[PDB]
Design an enzyme around this catalytic site. Structure first.
Site, PDB file in Angstrom:
ATOM      1  N   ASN A  26       0.788  -1.201   0.000  1.00  0.00           N
ATOM      2  CA  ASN A  26       0.000   0.000   0.000  1.00  0.00           C
ATOM      3  C   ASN A  26       0.823   1.254   0.000  1.00  0.00           C
ATOM      4  OD1 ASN A  26      -2.699  -1.382   0.109  1.00  0.00           O
ATOM      5  ND2 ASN A  26      -1.907  -1.951   2.126  1.00  0.00           N
ATOM      6  N   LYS A  75       3.216   4.369  -1.237  1.00  0.00           N
ATOM      7  CA  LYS A  75       3.296   5.186  -2.448  1.00  0.00           C
ATOM      8  C   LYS A  75       4.649   4.972  -3.160  1.00  0.00           C
ATOM      9  CE  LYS A  75       0.219   6.832  -4.216  1.00  0.00           C
ATOM     10  NZ  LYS A  75      -0.474   7.529  -5.328  1.00  0.00           N
ATOM     11  N   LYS A  82       4.859   2.844  -6.174  1.00  0.00           N
ATOM     12  CA  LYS A  82       4.821   1.634  -7.002  1.00  0.00           C
ATOM     13  C   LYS A  82       5.059   1.949  -8.485  1.00  0.00           C
ATOM     14  CE  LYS A  82       0.912   0.169  -5.159  1.00  0.00           C
ATOM     15  NZ  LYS A  82       0.829   1.035  -3.979  1.00  0.00           N
ATOM     16  N   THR A  83       4.310   2.942  -8.964  1.00  0.00           N
ATOM     17  CA  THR A  83       4.311   3.377 -10.321  1.00  0.00           C
ATOM     18  C   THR A  83       5.586   4.023 -10.655  1.00  0.00           C
ATOM     19  OG1 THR A  83       1.979   3.356 -10.554  1.00  0.00           O
ATOM     20  CG2 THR A  83       3.058   4.742 -12.130  1.00  0.00           C
ATOM     21  N   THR A  84       6.071   4.904  -9.738  1.00  0.00           N
ATOM     22  CA  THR A  84       7.324   5.620  -9.939  1.00  0.00           C
ATOM     23  C   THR A  84       8.456   4.594 -10.042  1.00  0.00           C
ATOM     24  OG1 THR A  84       7.322   6.103  -7.601  1.00  0.00           O
ATOM     25  CG2 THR A  84       6.669   7.872  -9.109  1.00  0.00           C
ATOM     26  N   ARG A 123      15.641   3.975 -16.773  1.00  0.00           N
ATOM     27  CA  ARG A 123      16.991   3.437 -16.768  1.00  0.00           C
ATOM     28  C   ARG A 123      17.179   2.573 -18.034  1.00  0.00           C
ATOM     29  NH1 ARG A 123      18.081   0.015 -11.486  1.00  0.00           N
ATOM     30  NH2 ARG A 123      18.801   2.017 -10.722  1.00  0.00           N
ATOM     31  N   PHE A 155     -13.773   4.065 -19.592  1.00  0.00           N
ATOM     32  CA  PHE A 155     -13.836   3.096 -18.476  1.00  0.00           C
ATOM     33  C   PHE A 155     -14.482   3.746 -17.246  1.00  0.00           C
ATOM     34  CE2 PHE A 155     -12.544   0.350 -14.967  1.00  0.00           C
ATOM     35  CZ  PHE A 155     -12.401  -0.908 -15.530  1.00  0.00           C
ATOM     36  N   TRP A 197     -15.815   1.682 -14.085  1.00  0.00           N
ATOM     37  CA  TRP A 197     -15.715   1.029 -12.782  1.00  0.00           C
ATOM     38  C   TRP A 197     -17.102   0.875 -12.167  1.00  0.00           C
ATOM     39  CZ3 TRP A 197     -11.108  -0.803 -10.861  1.00  0.00           C
ATOM     40  CH2 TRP A 197      -9.922  -0.137 -11.241  1.00  0.00           C
ATOM     41  N   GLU A 241      -0.685  -0.718 -12.914  1.00  0.00           N
ATOM     42  CA  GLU A 241      -2.003  -0.840 -12.327  1.00  0.00           C
ATOM     43  C   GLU A 241      -2.726  -2.062 -12.803  1.00  0.00           C
ATOM     44  OE1 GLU A 241      -2.093   0.708  -9.871  1.00  0.00           O
ATOM     45  OE2 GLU A 241      -1.353   2.830 -10.197  1.00  0.00           O
TER      46      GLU A 241
HETATM   47 CL    CL Z   1       3.588   6.189  -7.408  1.00  0.00          CL
END
Ligand code: CL
Ligand code: CL
Lengths: 157, 157
Positions: free
Chosen positions: A11, A13, A15-17, A25, A65, A67, A102
């Protein structure tokens, strides 16, 4: 080298970064990367803005989309369309890395068959590295992954 | 499923038979298999005789291969030619299994670059299973392998 599967879950912050940082890279190194973002942000795409001009294909979920429970048919269909792109990438011998951002929610809400995922991951080109992001990653996916980093939120703003 | 690398090594008899037995099962199951035999037998090829009519490509080392110290140039070239076939197979998304029989000696006598091997193995189609046979398998190859069975000779006739 042999391509691996990396999962950025938990959970916390970043993940995406993390996934985009890896991609950055790779590109910086001259590798070919492809990206699928299952979740469309209501903002400007910094990452896309950056990477895209470098030949990085981007595939974002349609705006349409919803949801919404009563829209499962249409939303499933939009997810399927975007994932077709993903499967294609996961089949490209020339793509060094594939980013599926995601992806965990698509599985967690049943908008895409886990089995298609497993299969797509399994049959990929041996040198291919794949990055999966998202909270609550399906266990089966975690079992298949080479690396799993869990973003635990120690503090949040 | 995910294709793995299996190695049948050791000094015991049955390395080749094991590999052909796996291939036989794969074909019996409807899978596509390809075979490379780095060592040409001076006899009739039972396995080939059997499998070949089932659409199994066979690639055997040229008769001309000598193993003579003063012929390294020519022998290396024959090995390279046959291995080209191998690399091709190791690049085929439609081949479910690839058999590299007696590959260990080619590496052990330096007739083929281990690096080409590692690379070829690594970049293969994800669903591809590869079977490597031969005494004294290079360690690096063993490190990359999913399964390693060592034929130890308890008795020999
Ligand atoms: Cl993120
Ligand atoms: Cl044998």
């Amino acid at each position: 080298e042999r391509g691996i599967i990396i999962v950025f879950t938990g959970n916390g912050k970043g993940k995406t970064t993390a996934a985009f940082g890896t991609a950055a890279r790779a590109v910086g190194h001259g590798k070919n990367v492809g990206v699928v973002q299952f979740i469309k942000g209501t903002w400007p795409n910094g990452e896309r803005n950056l990477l895209e001009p470098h030949g990085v294909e981007f595939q974002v979920m349609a705006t349409g989309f919803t949801w919404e429970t009563q829209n499962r048919e249409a939303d499933t269909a939009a997810c399927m369309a975007v994932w077709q792109h993903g499967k294609r990438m996961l089949a490209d011998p020339l793509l060094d890395m594939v980013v599926l951002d995601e992806l965990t929610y698509m599985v967690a809400y049943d908008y895409l068959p886990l089995e298609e995922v497993i299969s797509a991951l399994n049959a990929r080109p041996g040198h291919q590295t794949v990055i999966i992001t998202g909270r609550g990653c399906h266990r089966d996916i975690l079992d298949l992954a080479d690396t799993v980093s869990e973003l635990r939120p120690v503090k949040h703003a």
